[PDB]
A paper describes a structure:
The selective autophagy receptor p62/SQSTM1 is known to form higher-order filaments in vitro and to undergo liquid-liquid phase separation when mixed with poly-ubiquitin. p62 has a key role in selective autophagy by recognizing poly-ubiquitinated cargo and delivering it to the autophagosome. At the early stages of autophagy, selective autophagy receptors like p62 thereby bridge ubiquitinated cargo via conjugated Atg8 to the forming autophagosome.
In order to improve our detailed structural understanding of purified p62, we determined the cryo-electron microscopy (cryo-EM) structure of full-length p62. Due to pitch heterogeneity between 130 and 160 Å, we refined a more homogeneous subset with a 150 Å pitch and 13.6 units per turn (corresponding to 11.0 Å helical rise and a −26.1° helical rotation), including dihedral symmetry and obtained a 3D reconstruction at 4.5 Å global resolution. Consistent with the class averages, the local resolution varied significantly from a well-defined PB1 domain scaffold at 4.2 Å resolution up to over 9 Å for the more flexible regions. In comparison, the here determined full-length structure revealed only two well-resolved antiparallel PB1 scaffold strands, resulting in an open major groove, while the previously determined PB1 domain-only assemblies had one or two additional PB1 strands inserted into the closed helical assembly. In the full-length structure, the space required by the additional 340 C-terminal amino acids restricts the assembly to two antiparallel PB1 strands, leaving space for a major groove.
Residue numbers in the entry:
A (entry chain C), B (entry chain B), C (entry chain A), D (entry chain D), E (entry chain U), F (entry chain V), ...: 2 to 105
The structure:
Amino acid sequence: ASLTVKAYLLGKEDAAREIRRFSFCCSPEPEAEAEAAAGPGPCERLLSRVAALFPALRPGGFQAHYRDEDGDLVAFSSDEELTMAMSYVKDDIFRIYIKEKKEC
Amino acid sequence: ASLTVKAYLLGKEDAAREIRRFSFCCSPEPEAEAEAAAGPGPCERLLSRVAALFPALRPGGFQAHYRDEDGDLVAFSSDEELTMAMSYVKDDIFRIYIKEKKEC
Amino acid sequence: ASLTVKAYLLGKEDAAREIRRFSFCCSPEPEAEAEAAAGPGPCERLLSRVAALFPALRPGGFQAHYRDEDGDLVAFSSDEELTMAMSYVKDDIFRIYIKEKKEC
Amino acid sequence: ASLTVKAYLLGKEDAAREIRRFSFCCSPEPEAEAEAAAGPGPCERLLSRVAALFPALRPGGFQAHYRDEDGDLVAFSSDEELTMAMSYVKDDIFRIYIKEKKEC
Amino acid sequence: ASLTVKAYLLGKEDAAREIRRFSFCCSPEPEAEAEAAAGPGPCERLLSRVAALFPALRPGGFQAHYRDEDGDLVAFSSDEELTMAMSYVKDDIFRIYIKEKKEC
Amino acid sequence: ASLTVKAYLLGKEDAAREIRRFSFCCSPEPEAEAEAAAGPGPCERLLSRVAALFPALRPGGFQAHYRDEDGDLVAFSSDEELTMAMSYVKDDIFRIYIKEKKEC
Amino acid sequence: ASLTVKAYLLGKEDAAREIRRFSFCCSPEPEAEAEAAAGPGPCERLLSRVAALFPALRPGGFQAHYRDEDGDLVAFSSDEELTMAMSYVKDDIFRIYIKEKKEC
Amino acid sequence: ASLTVKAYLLGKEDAAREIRRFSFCCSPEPEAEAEAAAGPGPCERLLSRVAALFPALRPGGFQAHYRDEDGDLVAFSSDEELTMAMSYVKDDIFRIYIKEKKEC
C-alpha cells in the first residue's frame, strides 16, 4: 500500500508555510518475525518521518492534523486514531496539516 | 450501535480550542455475564474516554456539554441524563463541548 | 403528563450560570393506595429533584422562580402556587430560574 | 540521460526575476570505480550547479522548488526527494523555482 | 386532546392573506359504538373544517401544508400522514398553510 | 431500521414542485417463511410507495434519483443499486428526487 | 480491487444525459481453475455491464471513452487499451463517457 | 524507448474524428539473431499498428502525417522519413494525423 503524504506546515493565520510531499508505508510492514515487540506504531513512524524532513521543526514539538468533512482541522496523535484519519484519503494523497506547539 | 463523538474543547469566549472526534459504543455492551455489578456507567465510560484522549485536561476536572434546540450548552454528568443528551444526535455524530473547571 | 423542566441557575446580574434540563412528572402519581398520607407535595418533589442534580447548591438553600407575562421573576415555594406557575408552560418546557439564598 | 534544467529565480510576489536554463546529468555518472565513497549526491550536484551559475545568490542560501499537479511550489532538498521531483519532467525540461532564505 | 389549528391562507409569493385560528379534536372521538364504519378520517375532518371557515375557498380545491425542520412547506392529504404532520406541534398550535389548486 | 424518505418532485429547471416526506422499511422484512419467492424487491417496494402518494404521477412513469458527493442527480432503478443509493443517508433522511418520463 | 465506474452517457453537444455509477472488479477474478479458456476479457466484461444497466442503449451499439490529460475523449474498445484507460483513475472512480453509434 | 503515439484521425475540414493513443517501440527491437532479413521497417510496423486499432480504416488506405514547426501536416511513408518525423516528439507523445485516401 504505497501512500503519499502531503505535509502542509501551517503558519500564522493557518496559511501554509512549507509543503513537503513524501511517501508512507502504513499497511506495509517489515519481515514476519519478531526482532522486537512490534516496531514503532504506524503513527509513531509517521511523526518520526515528518520530523525528519522539515528542518524548521524538531521532534516532539508539533501537532499533526487532518481535515474532516466539516472542514475542521482534527488533530491526531494516536495510532488507533491515525486509522480514522486515513479514511479521508482521496486518491492516494493523505494531506496532513502540521502546527507547532507554542506557549499556550 | 457505532456512535461517533466529536469532542469540542472550548476556550476563552466559548470558541473551540481542540477537536478530537473519537468513536463510542453506548448501547453495545460486553459479555452477557456478571464479572462485576454492572461495569461503569455509559456516562462514566464516556468521560473516562474523553479524559484519555485530550492531553490538555485531567480526569475529574472537566464538564461535558451538548447543544439543545435553543442553542444553549446544556451540561450533563449523569447517565440518566446522557440518554437525553443522545436524543440530539444528527447523523451519527454526537457533538459534545468540553469546558474545564476553574476557580469560580 | 411528561413535563420537561429547564432549570436555569442565575448568577450575579441575573445571568444564567448553569442550565440542567430534566424531566418531571407532576400530574402522574404512584400506585393508587396509601403507603403514606400522600407522598411529598408536587412542589416538594420538584425542589428535591432540582437540588439532586445541581452540585453547586444544597437543599433548602435556593429559591425557584418563573417568568410571568410581565417578565418578572415570580417566586414559588408552595404547591398551590406551583399550579399557578405551571400555567405558563409553553410547549412542554417549564422554565424555572434558581437563585441561591445569601446573607440579606 | 541528458536533462535540461530551467532554473527560475523567484522574486517578491513569486514572479520570476532571472531564468538560467542549464543542462544536468543525474542518471549519468563518472568512471565505474571508487575514487571516493560515492561522489556527491544527485541533489547535492544540482544545488552546487544552480549556485555556480546565478551571481545573485550564494551557496547554502537558497531553496529549490518544483510545481506538482496542484500548482504548489513543493520544495526539495534531499536526493531521495529529487527523484520524486524529476517524475514531473515534461519533455526534457525540469523546471525548478529558486527562492532565497531570508529572515523568517 | 384540545388542539388549536392556526390556518394560514397563502397568497401570491407565499405571503399570508388570511389567518383563521380554530380548534381541532383529532385524538378525541365520538361515542364508543359504531353508527358507521368509523366516521370520516382525522385528516378528512380537518380539511372539512378548514373549508367550512374560509369563505374564499371551496372544498376539494385547496392543499394544506405544514413546515418541517427545514422550513419547507410539506403537503399532507392522508390521515397516516397527518399523524406525521402533528409531531411538529409547538405548544398546542398546529400551524397549517393553505394553498389553492390553480391551473398547473 | 426506520428510514425516512423525503421525496422531492422536480419541475422544469430541476426546481422542486412538491415534497412528500414518508417513511420506509428497507432492512425490515415480513414473517420469516415463504408465502412467495421473496416479496417484491426493496427498490420495487420503494417505487410502488412513491407512486402511491403523489397524485401528480402514475406508476411506471417516473425516474427516482439521489445526489452523490459531486452534486449530480444519479438515477437508480435496481435494488442492487438502491443499496448504493442508501449509503448517502445523512441522519435518517433519504432524499430522493423524482423526475417524470416525457417524450425524449 | 474494488473499482467504482461512473458511466456518463453523453448527449447532443457532449452534455451528459444520464449518469449511472456502478462498481467493477477488473483485477479480481473467479476461481483459479479453467472452466473455459479464460472468461471474457476485462473490457468485454465492462461493456457487457454498461449495456446491462442503461435501458437507453443496446449492446454492441455504444462507444465508451475516457478523458486523458488533454481533456480529449479518448475511446477504448480493447482490453490492452482498457489497462491504459485505468491509469487515469483518480480516487477509485473510473469515469467513462458513453456515446452511441449513429449513422456516420 | 517507450514511445506513446496519439493517432488523430482527421475528418472533413481537418477536424479530428477519432483519437486512439497507443504505445510504440521504435528503437526497441527483438532478439539479436536473424530469423529473417530484418523484420518489417519501423514505419511499416507503425502503419501496421495504426491500421489494427482503428475499425474505420483498412490497411493500405490511409496517409499518416505529423505537424512540423510551421504547423503544416507533413506526410511520411518511409522509414528514413519516420526518423525525421520523430524528432518532433514533445514529452513522449508522438502525435500523428491520419487521413484516408479518397478519389483524387
